[PDB]
Amino acid sequence: GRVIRGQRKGAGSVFRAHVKHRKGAARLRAVDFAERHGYIKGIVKDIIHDPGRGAPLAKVVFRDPYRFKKRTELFIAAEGIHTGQFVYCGKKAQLNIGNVLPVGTMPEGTIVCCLEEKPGDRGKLARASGNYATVISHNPETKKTRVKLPSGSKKVISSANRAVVGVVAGGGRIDKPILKAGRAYHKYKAKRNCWPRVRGVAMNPVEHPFGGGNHQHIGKPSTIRRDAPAGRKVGLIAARRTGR
């Protein structure tokens, strides 16, 4: 009768993200007249490490062409981006690494990162540590562009939405083994309270459907329908196939 683990994550207050020392949301620059028609140049100041995120971030300072002030954005640093480098963004921006421009302008076969799912959402796709999206084809009619996500799926997006040329810096983290429970603890201490995971078969049958029994076994098929109530949808959710 007890509420199982996984349901208690929805309420929060113990599974909330650890955002105390995070440097800020890594959002792409907002669309304006310069971005839409020409291009605007910014200067890379420093590359910062964001806790809980493998990919490093880069602070780029622009100048607002409406008021006398210096705007600062926190982009996701691509491979090869160094401090004291001019980075351009706009329709007329050239095809260089760390240079955000609309996908319609970029030719086919281009590798991009921080791709916008919708025009103006300031970057949503292929931005984790080293992932990248590849543009496949352009459709001048209806203003559509096909992109291949790192998951292997192909999605059709508008040609207006922008993306950053190159791959996300910091790739290859998963190659190094953790080798210790302590390193996993330190890794997950900066993200959430989710690392120590207890198997359902090791629990009592009051707090998990897989618990109980004189032998540590499941006793029921692990596959479960997607239309299953909370507290029962555990194991392999809507598994088309299960084995190796």
Q: Restricting to residues 57-116, which ones interact with RNA according to CB under 7 A?
A: none
Of residues 88, 95, 125, 160, which one binds RNA by CB under 7 A?
125
User: Bridge partners of 36?
Assistant: none
| Contact flags string 4-43 toward RNA, x per CB under 7 A | xxxxxxxxxxxxxxxxxxxxxxxx----------------
Neighbours of 170 (CB within 10 A): 18
Q: Restricting to residues 115-174, which ones interact with Mg ion according to CB under 5 A?
A: none
The torsion of the CA quartet 93, 95, 100, 102, rounded to 10 degrees, works out to 80
Of residues 102, 166, 200, 209, which one binds Mg ion by CB under 5 A?
209
Query: According to the annotation, is 147 in a ligand binding site?
Result: no
Give the nearest distance from C-beta 142 to RNA in angstroms: 8
Report if residue 52 touches RNA, rule: CB under 7 A: yes
Report if residue 214 touches RNA, rule: CB under 7 A: yes
Give the nearest distance from C-beta 193 to Mg ion in angstroms: 22
Report if residue 244 touches RNA, rule: CB under 7 A: yes
User: Per residue in 181-211, is it b (16+ CB within 10 Å) or e — as a string?
Assistant: eeeeeeeeebeeeeeeeeebeebeeebbbbb
Of residues 89, 130, 163, 169, which one binds RNA by CB under 7 A?
130
CA distance 148 to 64: 34
Binding site for Mg ion (CB under 5 A): 209
